[PDB]
Structure formats: C-alpha cells, structure tokens
Design an enzyme around this catalytic site. Sequence first.
Site, PDB file in Angstrom:
ATOM      1  N   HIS A 138       0.814  -1.260   0.000  1.00  0.00           N
ATOM      2  CA  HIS A 138       0.000   0.000   0.000  1.00  0.00           C
ATOM      3  C   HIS A 138       0.843   1.305   0.000  1.00  0.00           C
ATOM      4  O   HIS A 138       0.337   2.436  -0.041  1.00  0.00           O
ATOM      5  CB  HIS A 138      -0.998   0.028   1.161  1.00  0.00           C
ATOM      6  CG  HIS A 138      -0.426   0.366   2.530  1.00  0.00           C
ATOM      7  ND1 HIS A 138      -0.122  -0.596   3.446  1.00  0.00           N
ATOM      8  CD2 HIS A 138      -0.094   1.543   3.105  1.00  0.00           C
ATOM      9  CE1 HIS A 138       0.345  -0.068   4.490  1.00  0.00           C
ATOM     10  NE2 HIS A 138       0.349   1.187   4.331  1.00  0.00           N
TER      11      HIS A 138
ATOM     12  N   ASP B  55       0.265  -7.582   1.835  1.00  0.00           N
ATOM     13  CA  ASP B  55       0.667  -6.158   1.878  1.00  0.00           C
ATOM     14  C   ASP B  55       2.186  -6.025   2.083  1.00  0.00           C
ATOM     15  O   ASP B  55       2.755  -5.707   3.141  1.00  0.00           O
ATOM     16  CB  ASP B  55      -0.100  -5.420   2.969  1.00  0.00           C
ATOM     17  CG  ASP B  55       0.098  -3.924   2.882  1.00  0.00           C
ATOM     18  OD1 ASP B  55       0.513  -3.329   1.819  1.00  0.00           O
ATOM     19  OD2 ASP B  55      -0.156  -3.126   3.858  1.00  0.00           O
TER      20      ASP B  55
ATOM     21  N   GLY C 144       1.178   6.895   9.398  1.00  0.00           N
ATOM     22  CA  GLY C 144       2.438   7.705   9.510  1.00  0.00           C
ATOM     23  C   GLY C 144       3.704   6.781   9.254  1.00  0.00           C
ATOM     24  O   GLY C 144       4.706   6.989   8.503  1.00  0.00           O
TER      25      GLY C 144
ATOM     26  N   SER D  42       3.350   3.546   8.101  1.00  0.00           N
ATOM     27  CA  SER D  42       2.997   2.439   7.186  1.00  0.00           C
ATOM     28  C   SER D  42       4.277   1.942   6.515  1.00  0.00           C
ATOM     29  O   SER D  42       5.159   2.770   6.220  1.00  0.00           O
ATOM     30  CB  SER D  42       2.219   3.008   5.952  1.00  0.00           C
ATOM     31  OG  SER D  42       0.818   2.924   6.207  1.00  0.00           O
ATOM     32  N   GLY D  43       4.358   0.649   6.255  1.00  0.00           N
ATOM     33  CA  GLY D  43       5.584   0.112   5.626  1.00  0.00           C
ATOM     34  C   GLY D  43       6.761  -0.137   6.576  1.00  0.00           C
ATOM     35  O   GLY D  43       7.713  -0.828   6.208  1.00  0.00           O
TER      36      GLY D  43
END
Length: 222
Positions: A39, A83, A174, A176-177
């Site tokens: 994402h 994801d 904030g 993410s990943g």
Amino acid sequence: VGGYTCGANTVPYQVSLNSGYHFCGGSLINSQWVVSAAHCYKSGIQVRLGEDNINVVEGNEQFISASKSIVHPSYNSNTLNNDIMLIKLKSAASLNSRVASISLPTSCASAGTQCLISGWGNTKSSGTSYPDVLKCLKAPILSDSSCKSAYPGQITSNMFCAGYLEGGKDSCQGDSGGPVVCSGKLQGIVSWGSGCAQKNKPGVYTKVCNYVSWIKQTIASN
C-alpha cells in the site's frame, strides 16, 4: 501515543520513503534492497537511509533513488492481504554502524514474543520528540485468537496483531511500511489497524515469515 523517542541511528535498518516528503517507512534487507508495504507503492520513490530527524540534514544520511518496485503479485488493496513490496536501489548503500541490513526470519515468531516497532510520526506531534525524529514502541505479538476477535472476518493467515489491546500503546497512520523486529529478525511490516489513543484495536502487520521464499527468489532474479 504509545512509545518513545528511539535515539538517532539506534534502529540502523530503518528507512524513510520520500517522494517530496516522507510518506512510508521500510526496512533495509541488504545493500541494494528494501522491503515495505505494497500500500506504500508509488512512482518516483527516493530511499533515505541513516535518518533520525527527516527535516534536518544531521550528517549520516544516504539518499538513493529507487530503480524498481515489485508489489507482491497477489496483493489485494481492499483487504490488504499480502501487503508487501520490494524496492531495489539504483546504487548499493554503504553499510556502516548507522546504516545496517536486518535479517529475514528462518521461522515465524510465537505469540507473546516481544518486538520493536519503529517509525516516524504516529500523527500526533508533541509526546516526547518530533513527527520528525524516529519513534519506537515495544509490543508483544498477540494471539491469533485475540487478533481475530478484534477484526472478525478480516484477518488472514498473512497477518498478525501486536500491541496492547486496551487503550495501551499503538502507532497511528504515519508509520505504514515500517519494520516490526523481534529476536533480531524482521517479522512484520506495519500494514493497517483502527485507532491510536483509542481502545482495544491492535495494529495489524504483514507476516514476513510467509514471504521469505518469494523475497529471496524475487531479489536474486532482479
């Protein structure tokens, strides 16, 4: 909020994905590859290694652009199933004390194991330091039972939950990943969740241990 200020460069495999501004984190896997969440895919990514305050040049940074992004072939953006994405760097990073690779799991982590979750900017701003300096939270992996009961119908075999459930310590969009590291292995990726000084909705993380064979085959062929 949850966590605390990490200290500059105490999480040496932490990267910032910048496209004009910081929009995702990720983890350095070796000197030429980064893993992040699918994402977080976008065109024109630059990878920023060795960062603490992402608004100030402190002197240990490496800014390398991304030459290839590979989103997992079965990624579903509706459900965030699978994801995960890989990012290849145009040039290899100079590894040193402050810029380091994180190792991939040889096995999955048990519930109750302790992990470090890392990222910039939960949302907030004023807790201890900056949506600018890197923040850290230590959280237990939760039981599949609790994870599912928090999100009935929505949790797959490729997700796990961590945090504290009861209005404890979480992230907020904030981060993410970014990486979830436990027993010095990358065990997850910050994916999704539902609320930050909220209540009993744990964070949901990609379960890296299910993708190791894809990650090693994909990186060796690219």
